[PDB]
Amino acid sequence: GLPTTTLPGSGQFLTTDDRQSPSALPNYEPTPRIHIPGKVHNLLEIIQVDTLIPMNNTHTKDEVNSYLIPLNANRQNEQVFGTNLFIGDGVFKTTLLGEIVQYYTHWSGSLRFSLMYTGPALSSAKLILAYTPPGARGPQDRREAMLGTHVVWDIGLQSTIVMTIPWTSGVQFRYTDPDTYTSAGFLSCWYQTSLILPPETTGQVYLLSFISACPDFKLRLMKDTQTISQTVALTE
Amino acid sequence: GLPTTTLPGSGQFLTTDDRQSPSALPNYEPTPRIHIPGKVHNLLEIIQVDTLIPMNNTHTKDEVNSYLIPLNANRQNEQVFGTNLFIGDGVFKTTLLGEIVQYYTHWSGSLRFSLMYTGPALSSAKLILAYTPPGARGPQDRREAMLGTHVVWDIGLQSTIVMTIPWTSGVQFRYTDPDTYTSAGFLSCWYQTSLILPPETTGQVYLLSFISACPDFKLRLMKDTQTISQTVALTE
Amino acid sequence: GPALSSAKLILAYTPPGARGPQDRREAMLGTHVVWDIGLQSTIVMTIPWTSGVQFRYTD
Amino acid sequence: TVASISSGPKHTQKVPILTANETGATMPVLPSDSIETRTTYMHFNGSETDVECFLGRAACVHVTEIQNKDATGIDNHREAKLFNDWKINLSSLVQLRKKLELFTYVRFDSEYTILATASQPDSANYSSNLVVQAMYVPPGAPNPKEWDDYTWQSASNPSVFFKVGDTSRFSVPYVGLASAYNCFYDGYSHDDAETQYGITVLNHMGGMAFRIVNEHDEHKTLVKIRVYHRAKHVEAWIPRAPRALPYTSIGRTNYPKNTEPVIKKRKGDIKSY
Amino acid sequence: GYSDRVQQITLGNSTITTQEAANAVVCYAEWPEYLPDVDASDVNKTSKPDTSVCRFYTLDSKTWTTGSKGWCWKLPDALKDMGVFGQNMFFHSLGRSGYTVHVQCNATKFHSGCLLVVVIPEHQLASHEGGNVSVKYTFTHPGERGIDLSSANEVGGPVKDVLYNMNGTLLGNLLIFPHQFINLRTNNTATIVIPYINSVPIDSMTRHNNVSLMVIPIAPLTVPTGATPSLPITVTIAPMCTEFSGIRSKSIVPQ
Amino acid sequence: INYYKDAASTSSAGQSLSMDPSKFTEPVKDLMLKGAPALN
Amino acid sequence: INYYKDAASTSSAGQSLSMDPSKFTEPVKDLMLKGAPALN
């Protein structure tokens, strides 16, 4: 008989501990694995695939239309859309990125925001996208917007433009749930010159917008998502 | 005194765990082993010996007669017997194979079904045995039956015919207790030409049928058999 | 057609033994090419020699 | 590892930021393709986002309850909660379910922890000490009919006996019939016109029956069982869109009617911040 | 002078040419291949009809109009009646296949509109009834007709609400599945190569569909002034590396 | 040290440290180079 | 590691991995070859 002493914590059950256990089914042989395409190893692998952002959130019931950012022909100087960058809330929240970020407490890294244009091929347009780093207000006019991170996008044969929100930060991690100290800025978009439709054409054209994370990205300290809850256990 | 921590599960008794225990009889010397023919090591060794199937289940009290499949002289085109292949139930259930399969939850592998003919030596017959893989109904006539796994059996000097139900399956294991998704097919038998008795002879002739497992076979995840129960403890 | 128009046609060869196809579904089950009208103005379909007998009559 | 390299002014014919999303790719664009950057290192590995880590902590998967009371004159033990079964599932309490259904096929060993606590809602002199028996009943085994049937002998079926207030813990290998468990299945068990859709044995993980071994004392004792499940040795294939609407049933994808808009409406314009 | 843009796919006795492609997607970066022995379970030798089943079948055409919500086809169902592919299907117990899907929609440089073409492995649909109502067989086996998401709820059928993918997930996130867009201004076809994806090495072709192909208008169709307000969309699909096993009597399926 | 005989009884697995998003982010048939035109 | 002195006190035995059904499936005196006639 070897002398032992038990410490504080004996008998506790910590849902996060990782130890060995007896197998209830001694000697059982599991089914062989066969090959299946698509294996995922890290959630970091999947948040780099871009998905659509319901940017046009202004509706009243969920609709395919809140994915469409409208553009008006012949407007000059004006603003196309605006949003803050609380990736865990608001427009971002239902996107795959938003949806995964919510399983973690802290995030750090660059984001990739792209816009794909869908107007007739014989039209043309020049837009400016601007990222405003924390510390200033959402820009109120392009002059204000153009003094921060921006890209003049020229609509052409190449249909999409990929803007990166480079990680601009004092503190090396931000909270995924919106927090002030930790806030990330604003994203706005304005006409640089203006949309022009060809003859025989009319109305609004739309941009689709996507979001995905750069390879830069870090997420840490897992927790429970506000995105799902329940009141009684389900049954069959 | 070495510091320890006890984990969740301490003090539990799991009937399936395998550990050391003090011997109550320290130093006792067991009787020497002598040699005995017949040692069994695996249940897989014994389910390869074939045993008779009470195929003729149509009686009302258990009788030697439900082991006998009758054959009629001069019938043409017609059907000799039919059964599904739920090896854990129905005809199969009391056979040694059926009886062991019931100690496990899953089975996979090929089955060997053979028929031994017992009619007078001066008679003759040609039968077709057909295996119908999952997905179609039990065949309704030989034409239907002959399009799946089948063997034309010619009754001769060699008294038995061994049909194999080759493992035909998407999923690599099936349930021993009958389940749909997991179902294995049907087995039917029809006259290929017809039984013919010699002169001075009359009546029905019978086939005996056996079942055993091919060396192919796998059984896993042990459990309790529905084949035995009790209401009070027995006594001497 | 005008350069600013567009079209997609299917050409189908039906080997001997069946009737002239009566609808595209029927037609598309034999030798066929989906032609996409583009910059490249012509499409070349080949009727590959499908035959039991190695020569046919011209009449 | 560098998180960003140093990059300076650009005036090229080579534009990495113009792409064609119609292709289905997400081109790997970085901050340094469109602004001037400085070197910085990652200092991080992505350890805690590994799927083994993501699915590897215990989650509550089931809460049931049984009572110890005089069975004298009870015509239906099962119905008096004299004993109770549970066909194992991971899709009845939604927290873990949403996590698993981020994948289509999943393969793992399970570690179960079972906590049992007792309650004595009405006048008792004391708290008795009860031993719970949890039997693993694979499909085809006789199922308990009374709280003290021959079934409980469990001569071939793994069972664990632990005390109420304590915890039991054991681990079961991956018992799936196929190579992975299907998180989803767009099929039937056969081509029947009325058979159930979606629910499949492909997911089946066994089933478990609980009872108190103790005979009855003078008062009644409620024992409530909580089953926790931790995936170990995880393998996951084919990522899918996360669950947006609420769940209604174990094993079907169905969402409730007149549900509410899941995308938050702006308080303001598209232009709003 | 090769462009990402022009392409030719020849499979069997049938060829497709596109002069306005946008590359092609190969699901999960894997190309269809036959079933290796190391992965095999059923002991039966399989049948590989090759060129008689691995050719292009063009399903009947759809009509995109300003009110369209989107269409959904299931595989191998959509092909259950195409030539010898279909016969093989009803006649063997098990079968396995990959596909090349080519979705076509051409317009002019004055039109606008953008379709999402996506392949979803194991797309289990939801009942519009809620609760645990099932979706009857016939409803998930529309055949070449596919399911029309702008048709009405029917009884025993699935829900047809587009912002929810017919299953409780948001349209916006379908982009995690292999997919390609058809943006009239860019593109005129979409091509996806689908490798066989299942948790078993071979399965039944009638009780289980292993992918749904979905074409969904996202930026509404907008035709030039006084143009007819609609465009046809055509889907052509070719089984590739098909194998059938466990031949017999010929399945009888509901309805 | 494993104290138990069966593999299911061992603790959690250890980090894939595999990580290759290209099956998801770039499943295109003809390779796309960043910087080169998307559609040629 | 055995902690106890007696052999009865050790854990379960380890798989025979013996397996030879012929004492049960083919106890015939003159050897039968599959493929050759049963009765000559």
Swiss-Prot record, chains F, G:
It comes from Human rhinovirus 14 (HRV-14). This is Capsid protein VP4. Lies on the inner surface of the capsid shell. After binding to the host receptor, the capsid undergoes conformational changes. Capsid protein VP4 is released, Capsid protein VP1 N-terminus is externalized, and together, they shape a pore in the host membrane through which the viral genome is translocated into the host cell cytoplasm. It is found in: Virion. Interacts with capsid protein VP1 and capsid protein VP3. The chain holds residues 30 to 69 of 2179 of the full protein. Myristoylation is required during RNA encapsidation and formation of the mature virus particle.
